[PDB]
Every structure is written in C-alpha cells, then in structure tokens.
Symmetry: none
Subunit: 130 residues, 2 copies
Amino acid sequence: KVFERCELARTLKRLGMDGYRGISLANWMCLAKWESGYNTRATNYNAGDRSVDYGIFQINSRYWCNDGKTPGAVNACHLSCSALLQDNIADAVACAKRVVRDPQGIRAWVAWRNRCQNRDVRQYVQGCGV
Amino acid sequence: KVFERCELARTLKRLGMDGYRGISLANWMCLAKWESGYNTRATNYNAGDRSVDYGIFQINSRYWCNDGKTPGAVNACHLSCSALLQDNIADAVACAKRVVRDPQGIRAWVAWRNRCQNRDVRQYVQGCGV
C-alpha cells in the first residue's frame, strides 16, 4: 500500500512515533519517503550479504526480521519479514521502534543521514493535523 | 531455444540492451554465453539455498521471479520463473534490466566476473552486423 502523505503522518502519530527516542514525526516521514516512497510492499536486494530490505521503513532480514533465506540472520524484532509487507504497519512500527533502540539510532538508515539529517523536514508533515 | 550467437546479439540490440546501464551488447553476450550457453531452457539448482537460476541470463528464484516452490520468495520482476524459460526473451530481458539497476550492475553474476570482466569481449559480437 502506498499511503498518502498526510494519512501516513496521522497513523504514525497515532502509533506513538512522534518524539519516540527523541525522533520527530517529520523525521520518521522523511525516512519513509526516501526508503520506500511510503510503499509497504517495497523491497531491495543486498547481494553482498544476501539480505533483503522490507517495507515502508526498509527493515533488513539480516538483523531485524526472519525471511528464512538470509545467512547469519538475527531476528531481534522477532517477526517474519512478510509481516512488514502488509498494509497494516503496526508490526513495522514496532520493529522500527526496536531498530532505533540500538546504539546507532535512526542513523541506522543511511538514506536518512543523506536526505534528512540537518535538513528542513517540515514539508513531510505540513497540513496534516498532527 | 538455443540461439545462435548473432541472432541473440541482434535480439538483445532490438530490445535496447546495448549501452543499458553502461553495459555494452558484447558484455551481455558474454554473460549469456557463460551462464546458459545461449539456451532459454537452462536451469541451475543450488542445493545450498535450494533456489533455482532460470534461462538465458540465469536469474535466481530467491528475489527475482516466483516459481511457487521457494519459501520467502520476493518476486521483484513480477513474473513466474517459467516465463523466463520461453523462446521469446522479452520478459527475461525486462527482468535482466531490473537486476542491473542495482549498484554493482552486471557484476552481480559470478560467471561474468570469472569469464568476462577485464577481458577482451569483442569476440562475442564480431561478424554479427550490430
């Protein structure tokens, strides 16, 4: 599912994401926009280590979710990766909340560092009632 | 269908493979050569991950196509692996173009690295009129 900007914003707000671990709703949204274009069904293949990135927040099968086909796979989120390709993003948010608990934080996502960090991210939440 | 050298060279050319992603027709031809011997029906089973490589470009069933018997399958090319075994290589071409959109490009194939990379590949297209 491709959420519409404001629809994703209110949902992530409702799911307790604004100010989670000091991360604003506008940053979560900026991450989602650059990772997947707000599409829950997005994926990417990492040929170097045989992992795949799943969902709206592009969570990797090597450390976070289990897809049963990634060597050295840890399942810190304790959920199948398929669960992160669903229209209902509750599981993805809970896994994203786990990711940023690591001593790396939201900087775990490279694209966030390159497209959101230190930049104006107000557009992501402009006029959504959040 | 096992294509003859120049027949495939000309087909790949009309399907817009020359120069695609910086990859010359000659490199694509060298890939076809060492991956499948130019055979659209070639398949390679890997006992390790239990996945199968299909057709002329030997596209793997883990992330690219769906063969219905590979758990955790992500079907990034949006097609059954069987469509990659047909005489018409249009879908195989479309799927190959997708694979090389990744950063490493054609270097994703082990055989290309072993047999084509850093080598004079002009042999595969000479005499073909392309």
